């Protein structure tokens, strides 16, 4: 795969005019993005203290809530169009592939 | 170990110099140091990355000798203030004499500050609880002693940070990575890392006598912490798997910026370190990594408009961020600014000014790049993309995001951004035409207007989904349903109202192109229809500013002469007819219905009927009048009756 | 070897702890009687 040139998938929307450029942006980024005058006031110590307390509360909340080969694997998956898709037509995210995976991997003093 | 009058002073003095010696020790490794210090039970005084469960309980003695002491509890988040309050309550001390008593350790000769955590000063959890004393003295002397001791302890902590930095710097490269890796883990295991790095003795800075020195020490310590974090980051592998815990580190930087934004040196260091981290973690910051830094930068930017130095620095930093990560950076910036948009938040004008700055080149006043550990040309991190963008590109990006997932929260945020941004762009165009009246300026104005029109047409085409119709859960659902529609109506009504009249006057100089195609008028009308369908059930949709602005401020401006466009009006008229028919059918709705907005709806209708009389022949309007007069009569207030009679008069005239 | 080292020092101080207990008893008795005296001084 490394021999072939890279060509990552890009965002494409069909329901748009023909004069709309549809800027160039990666599909993975869009997917993860969607899935997820007086200055006297700010100089007061009270405002700084409030901001710091807000930061500390956020940090406490976060605390409460809480290799190279694999990196290459995702890099290749992102760069090339047909990777991990068997026979080029099966579809890496097809329902029938899920059915095949579940039936094949089904296992059980 | 041994008590002494000048013990902590000696420790501070030693620490101020230890980091110079540490640079000359050959085989000093983190593991050995940690194990030795732990075995000696004094690691806290040397390593900032030291975790020690503090005393569970404390014993305090009163004024008299051998009087009943008190055995109070100590938790993980208890400060000496609550302990002192409990002491006062137990010892029956009048409130008038409540500012003369302080808790101090006679053995170690320490006078305790109110807002310093107890567990920090007594990390040792031994069989013996520390003995404190409630000593009475003049408030001034107590404050002076507290200032002195906190100054000394801050010096100690500065020395510790310096020691760690020096140790990290002076180690063999082959063993560097693992070392820094461990330095992360310990920091994550600390229950009080972010607080220790960020928290400051605010209440003491106000002291005129000794606040300046404390604040200087604070800014030095913050700078050192930032430097240490940068060193730790740059030692890691570039593809380290980060979770949300990254914030716990990145937020530290923010803590400095909030406190000392106005300090040229600290601001420079912050900018340089953020740029270095972004370059190092290319994959992370190219995906979701600017959602942690940017909000605080925007807040400071907006809150210090009067500081051209700070503004220029932030603009330069954002320009470098763009030159690095290009469009993902802009999208993440919009996501980060959406929550703070006001239209105590970032105004549409501050955002517009920041984008304006990004539109051009900015000089390095502070010489930030000197501190940047990367290639000075600083080419794009991703090989896919040498260009400069405009606001039009940002509008395109927002439109594309909306089109991709119209029914999503991020789409809502992008719509808000667009609503805040478009009017400023229009004003910019107007000003540009004004200052310079040359013909090419006019030509560029037409071209920009055309581009924006096409972009908004694409938006309206791709936002078809919202056309569909339809206790706290109900509120949330309705809010989500109506906000995007309101924002779209606002954007398009404002665009048409501003430009349309401007087209004639501009064309006066030196073939008017339709701003919005018929299909887009129909789409906007059926959006308004979907919104009206719920409007009688919910008061807030009736009060909707965007709905009212559309009905009474755009329907009169569109030229309904074209039979192709007319059905967009017919749909709205039919919906108004059906709606008022319902209102009249059952008085149950009529009991709680608010009619002041509906008067504005009728006012929009008759405004259209006045502006173009050609509307009046179409039959669907007659029925609306009839039911309306029927609805008049059990008596609508004046503001509605006046509108109804005015509509009747207009119809008669037509 | 580290286990045996730990065991050896642990048992050494486990022997020392008995002397510690006895002297602690004596000194606690003396100091408690002195605190009783001071209480009388109240």
Swiss-Prot record, chain A:
Maturation and modification: Phosphorylated on tyrosine residues.
Locations listed in the record: Cell membrane
Signal peptide limits: none
Disorder association: Hypotonia, infantile, with psychomotor retardation and characteristic facies 1: A neurodegenerative disease characterized by variable degrees of hypotonia, speech impairment, intellectual disability, pyramidal signs, subtle facial dysmorphism, and chronic constipation. Some patients manifest neuroaxonal dystrophy, optic atrophy, unmyelinated axons and spheroid bodies in tissue biopsies. Congenital contractures of the limbs and face, hypotonia, and developmental delay: A disease characterized by congenital contractures of the limbs and face, resulting in characteristic facial features, abnormal tone, most commonly manifested as hypotonia, and variable degrees of developmental delay.
Described purpose of this protein according to its UniProt entry: Voltage-gated ion channel responsible for the resting Na(+) permeability that controls neuronal excitability. NALCN channel functions as a multi-protein complex, which consists at least of NALCN, NALF1, UNC79 and UNC80. NALCN is the voltage-sensing, pore-forming subunit of the NALCN channel complex. NALCN channel complex is constitutively active and conducts monovalent cations but is blocked by physiological concentrations of extracellular divalent cations.
Quaternary structure annotation from Swiss-Prot or TrEMBL: Found in a complex with NALCN, UNC79, UNC80 and NACL1; these auxiliary subunits are indispensable for the function of NALCN channel. Interacts with UNC80; required for the NALCN activation/inhibition by GPCRs in neurons. Found in a complex with NALCN, UNC79 and UNC80; UNC80 bridges NALCN to UNC79. Interacts with CHRM3.
Family: Belongs to the NALCN family.
Record remark on domains: Contains 24 transmembrane helices (TM) that form four homologous functional repeats connected by intracellular linkers. Each of the four internal repeats contains five hydrophobic transmembrane segments (S1, S2, S3, S5, S6) and one positively charged transmembrane segment (S4). S4 segments represent the voltage-sensor. S4 transmembrane segments lack some of the charged residues (K and R) found at every third position in the S4s of the NaV, CaV, and KV channels.
Name the UniProt record assigns to this protein: Sodium leak channel NALCN
Upper classification of the organism: Eukaryota, Metazoa, Chordata, Craniata, Vertebrata
UniProtKB/Swiss-Prot annotation, chain B:
Disulfide bonds: none
GO molecular function: monoatomic cation channel activity
Tissue: Moderately expressed in fetal brain, spinal cord, skeletal muscle, thymus, spleen, fetal liver, small intestine, colon, kidney and uterus. Highly expressed in adrenal gland, prostate and testis, as well as in brain and cerebellum.
Residues spanning the membrane: 328-343, 446-466
GO cellular component, one term: plasma membrane
Keywords carried by this UniProt record: Cell membrane, Disease variant, Membrane, Neurodegeneration, Phosphoprotein, Transmembrane, Transmembrane helix
Superkingdom field: Eukaryota
Primary localisation category: membrane
Subcellular location: Cell membrane
Similarity section: Belongs to the unc-80 family.
Role description: Auxiliary subunit of the NALCN sodium channel complex, a voltage-gated ion channel responsible for the resting Na(+) permeability that controls neuronal excitability. Activated by neuropeptides substance P, neurotensin, and extracellular Ca(2+) that regulates neuronal excitability by controlling the sizes of NALCN-dependent sodium-leak current. UNC80 is essential for NALCN sensitivity to extracellular Ca(2+).
Protein name: Protein unc-80 homolog
Organism: Homo sapiens
């Amino acid at each position: 795969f490394e021999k072939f040139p890279n060509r990552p998938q890009m965002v494409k929307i069909s329901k748009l005019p023909s004069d709309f450029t549809v800027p160039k942006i990666r599909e993975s980024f869009m997917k993860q993005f969607i899935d997820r005058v007086f200055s006297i006031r700010a100089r007061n110590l009270l405002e700084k203290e409030t901001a710091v307390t807000k930061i500390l509360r956020a940090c406490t909340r976060q605390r409460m809530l809480s290799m190279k080969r694999k990196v290459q694997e995702e890099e290749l998956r992102e760069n090339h169009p047909y990777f991990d898709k068997p026979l080029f037509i099966v579809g890496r995210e097809h329902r029938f592939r899920n059915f095949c995976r579940v039936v094949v991997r089904a296992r059980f003093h | 170990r041994t008590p002494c009058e000048w013990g902590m002073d000696a420790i501070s003095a030693t620490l101020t110099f230890l980091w110079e010696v540490v640079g000359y020790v050959e085989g000093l490794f983190f593991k050995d140091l940690k194990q030795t210090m732990k075995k000696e039970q004094c690691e806290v005084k040397l390593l900032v990355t030291a975790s020690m469960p503090g005393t569970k309980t404390l014993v305090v003695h009163g004024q008299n000798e051998c009087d009943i002491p008190t055995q109070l509890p100590v938790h993980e988040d208890t400060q000496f203030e609550a302990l002192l309050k409990e002491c006062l309550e137990f010892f029956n001390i009048p409130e008038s004499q409540s500012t003369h008593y302080f808790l101090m350790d006679k053995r170690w000769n320490l006078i305790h500050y109110n807002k310093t955590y107890v567990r920090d000063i007594y990390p040792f959890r031994r069989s013996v609880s520390p003995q404190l004393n409630l000593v009475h003295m003049h408030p001034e002397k107590g404050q002076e002693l507290i200032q002195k001791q906190v100054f000394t302890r801050k010096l100690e902590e500065v020395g510790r940070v310096l020691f760690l930095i020096s140790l990290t710097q002076k180690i063999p490269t082959a063993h560097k990575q693992s070392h820094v890796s461990m330095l992360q883990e310990d920091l994550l295991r600390l229950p009080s890392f972010p607080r220790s790095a960020i928290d400051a003795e605010f209440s003491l800075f106000s002291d005129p006598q000794a606040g300046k020195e404390l604040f200087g020490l604070d800014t030095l310590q913050k700078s050192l912490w930032i430097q240490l974090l940068e060193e730790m980051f740059l030692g890691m592998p570039s593809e380290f798997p980060w979770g949300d815990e990254i914030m716990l580190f990145l937020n530290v930087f923010n803590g400095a910026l909030i406190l000392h934004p106005e300090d040229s040196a600290l601001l420079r260091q912050y900018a340089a370190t953020v740029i270095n981290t972004a370059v190092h973690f290319n994959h992370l910051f190219s995906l979701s990594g600017y959602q942690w830094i940017l909000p605080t930068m925007l807040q400071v930017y907006s809150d210090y408009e009067s500081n051209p130095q700070l503004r220029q620095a932030i603009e330069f930093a954002c320009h470098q961020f763009y030159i690095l990560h290009r469009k993902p950076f802009v999208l993440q910036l919009f996501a980060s600014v959406a929550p703070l948009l006001e239209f105590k938040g970032v105004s549409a004008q501050c955002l517009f000014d920041l984008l304006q700055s990004l539109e051009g080149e900015t000089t390095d006043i502070l010489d930030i790049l000197e501190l940047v550990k990367a290639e000075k040309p600083l080419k794009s991190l991703d090989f896919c993309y040498d260009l400069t963008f405009s606001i039009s590109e940002a509008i395109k990006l927002c439109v594309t995001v909306v089109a991709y997932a119209p029914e999503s929260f991020r789409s809502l945020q992008m719509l808000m951004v667009l609503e805040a941004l478009v009017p400023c762009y229009l004003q910019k165009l107007k000003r540009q035409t004004s200052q310079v009246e040359t013909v090419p300026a006019a030509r560029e104005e037409i071209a920009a207007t055309a581009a924006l029109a096409t972009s908004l047409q694409a938006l309206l085409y791709s936002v078809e989904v919202l056309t569909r119709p339809m206790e706290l859960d109900e509120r949330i659902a309705r809010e989500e349903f109506r906000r995007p529609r309101e924002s779209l109506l606002n954007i398009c009504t404002e665009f048409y109202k501003h430009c349309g009249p401007r087209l004639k006057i501009l064309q006066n100089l030196a073939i008017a192109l339709e701003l919005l195609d018929v299909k887009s008028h129909m789409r906007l009308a059926e959006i308004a229809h979907s919104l009206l369908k719920l409007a009688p059930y919910d008061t807030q949709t009736m009060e909707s500013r965007g709905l009212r602005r559309y009905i009474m401020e755009m329907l009169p401006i569109t030229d309904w002469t074209a039979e192709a466009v007319r059905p967009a009006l017919i749909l709205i008229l039919k919906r108004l007819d059906r709606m008022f028919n319902k209102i009249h059918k059952m008085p149950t709705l009529r009991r709680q219905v608010e009619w002041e907005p509906a008067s504005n709806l009728i006012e929009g209708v008759c405004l259209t009927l006045q502006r173009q009389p050609i509307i009046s022949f179409l039959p669907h309007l007659r029925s609306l009048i009839n039911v309306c007069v029927n609805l008049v009569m059990l008596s609508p207030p004046l503001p509605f009756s006046t509108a109804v009679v005015r509509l009747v008069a207009l119809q008669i005239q037509a | 070897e580290q286990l045996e080292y730990t065991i050896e020092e642990e048992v050494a101080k486990q022997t020392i702890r008995m002397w510690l207990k006895k002297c602690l008893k004596r000194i606690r008795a003396k100091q408690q009687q002195s605190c009783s005296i001071i209480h009388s001084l109240r």
